[PDB]
Amino acid sequence: TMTARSLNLKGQSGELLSLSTADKSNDAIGTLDAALTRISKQRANLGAYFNRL
């Protein structure tokens, strides 16, 4: 894991000091589910691994 684990969307139309903007709001919400899903699965992989040990 790292921030590039999910689609790393920050900021929004309007004033920024960056050169990037967020994408389709609905997909940004979906992205956060993806972020959580990807890490939750990795934690569970460790969880399951612990139970194996």
């Binding site: 309007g14 004033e15 050169l19 903007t21 994408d23 389709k24």
Partner: protein, 237 residues
């Protein structure tokens, strides 16, 4: 007209054609030339960059076909629940929103492909190869389609770094549409600062860059010390 005015008229029309919204005749011409250039270039990373660029343009072309088909299918429906004017307005807005959402996804997929085309061109490290007309032609085509994909959806601030990279390549700076788009996108950003009551440094930065590219586009299409050049200079100064 003089030999320079005749030449200029010819070139501006070719440049307007160059930035023409994509269609099947332009697609065919573009990819037939790019594949011949790829065979001349004989570089696997250029070949891969072209394969991805073409996939990106195909996403755009397939989307254009979808938009016509979708609007057609909607037009052909009987609407029994459209009895009031406010219902017609609502349903019209619902159609436009679905079309915009799908075009947004097509843009996202097309830019993922364009990004891959650039990532493959980045892998050509030899400076004698990066200076090849084949390399600069493809890189220019990738940036041009990228700019247009965002432009169509009004994502104008996002077009600036790509337009700026575009004009740095092989005399692209002498293209009237390139300066027209830069000036328009900078104008949008100036207006955003005025509407959101943002800092003065950004107001003037964006206004300045609008005026530079406004005047340069004018110079390129009409000529230095033309009635049109003289006018824009006098308004700005």
């Amino acid at each position: 007209l003089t030999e320079d005015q005749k030449k200029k008229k010819k070139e501006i029309m070719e440049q307007e054609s160059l930035w023409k919204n994509p269609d099947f005749k332009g697609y065919n011409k573009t990819f037939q030339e790019l594949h011949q250039l790829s065979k001349t270039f004989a570089n696997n990373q250029f070949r891969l960059a072209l394969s991805n660029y073409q996939s990106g343009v195909n996403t755009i072309m397939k989307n254009r076909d979808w938009v016509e088909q979708y609007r057609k299918e909607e037009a052909e429906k009987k609407r029994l629940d459209e009895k009031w004017y406010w219902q017609k307005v609502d349903r019209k807005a619902r159609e436009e929103r679905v079309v915009y959402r799908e075009k947004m996804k097509a843009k996202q997929d097309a830019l993922n492909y364009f990004s891959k085309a650039i990532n493959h061109l980045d892998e050509i490290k030899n400076p004698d190869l990066r200076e090849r007309p084949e390399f600069k032609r493809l890189l220019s085509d990738v940036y041009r389609s990228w700019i247009m994909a965002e432009y169509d959806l009004q994502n104008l601030p996002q077009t600036i770094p790509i337009l700026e990279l575009y004009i740095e390549i092989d005399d692209n700076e002498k293209e009237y549409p390139a300066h027209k788009y830069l000036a328009s996108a900078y104008s949008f950003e100036e207006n955003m600062i005025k509407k959101t009551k943002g800092p003065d440094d950004m107001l003037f930065k964006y206004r300045y860059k609008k005026n530079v590219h406004l005047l340069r586009a004018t110079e390129l299409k009409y000529g230095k010390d033309s009635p049109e050049y003289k006018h824009i200079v006098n308004v700005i100064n």
